[PDB]
Amino acid sequence: VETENIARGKQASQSSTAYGGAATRAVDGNVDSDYGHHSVTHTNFEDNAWWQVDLGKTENVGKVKLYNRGDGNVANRLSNFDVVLLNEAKQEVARQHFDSLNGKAELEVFFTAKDARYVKVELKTKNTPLSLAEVEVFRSA
Numbered sequence: 150v151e152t153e154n155i156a157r158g159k160q161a162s163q164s165s166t167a168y169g170g171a172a173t174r175a176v177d178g179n180v181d182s183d184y185g186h187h188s189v190t191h192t193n194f195e196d197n198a199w200w201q202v203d204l205g206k207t208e209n210v211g212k213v214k215l216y217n218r219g220d221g222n223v224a225n226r227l228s229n230f231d232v233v234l235l236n237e238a239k240q241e242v243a244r245q246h247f248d249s250l251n252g253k254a255e256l257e258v259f260f261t262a263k264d265a266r267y268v269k270v271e272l273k274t275k276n277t278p279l280s281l282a283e284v285e286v287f288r289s290a
């Protein structure tokens with residue numbers, strides 16, 4: 150993949166916002182995973198929480214990297230989730246399911262040369278907030 154993080158500074162949004170955990174914290178160029186350092190997102194405790202970045206145009210995506218929240222022993226909240234690519238009309242062009250990050254600070258998701266404008270993370274879990282320290286997106290080589 151290319152090295153430029155194309156998610157950086159892009160428009161981001163999420164299902165809801167709590168504890169001041171603004172969606173733009175996942176694309177601020179800071180992977181610091183300590184919620185107290187203000188670079189980690191947070192939605193409401195809700196069903197099927199989600200977070201999205203608009204790349205602003207259609208790009209050929211090869212890698213999405215998720216960085217989990219690291220403080221407070223709540224890393225497990227990022228489990229049973231999909232990483233979704235959508236085209237400009239917001240139709241799904243790819244989707245990968247993950248049970249867990251297994252303790253790891255991050256997860257690398259590789260997509261097979263998908264032309265997509267939106268990258269979405271979707272929890273499939275009830276009454277669970279979605280918190281991401283950072284989402285980075287890289288073009289196919």
Ligand SMILES: CC(=O)N[C@@H]1[C@@H](O[C@@H]2O[C@H](CO)[C@H](O)[C@H](O)[C@H]2O[C@@H]2O[C@@H](C)[C@@H](O)[C@@H](O)[C@@H]2O)[C@H](O[C@@H]2O[C@@H](C)[C@@H](O)[C@@H](O)[C@@H]2O)[C@@H](CO)O[C@@H]1O
Pocket residue numbers: 168184185186220221222223
């Ligand atoms: C229980 C409630 O959510 N607490 C909120 C505070 O967050 C908790 O603070 C604790 C120390 O005071 C400790 O750090 C806990 O780990 C932390 O709880 C975690 O994070 C929050 C944001 C939620 O996701 C909880 O479900 C989770 O268990 C919060 O404190 C502020 O953020 C934390 C991370 C830390 O930086 C702290 O020093 C900050 O004051 C406060 C203020 O918004 O609000 C709740 O009380």
Ligand SMILES: [Ca+2]
Pocket residue numbers: 174175176177178179180181188189281282283
């Ligand atoms: Ca961040």
Ligand code: NI
Pocket residue numbers: 183185186
């Ligand atoms: Ni600190």
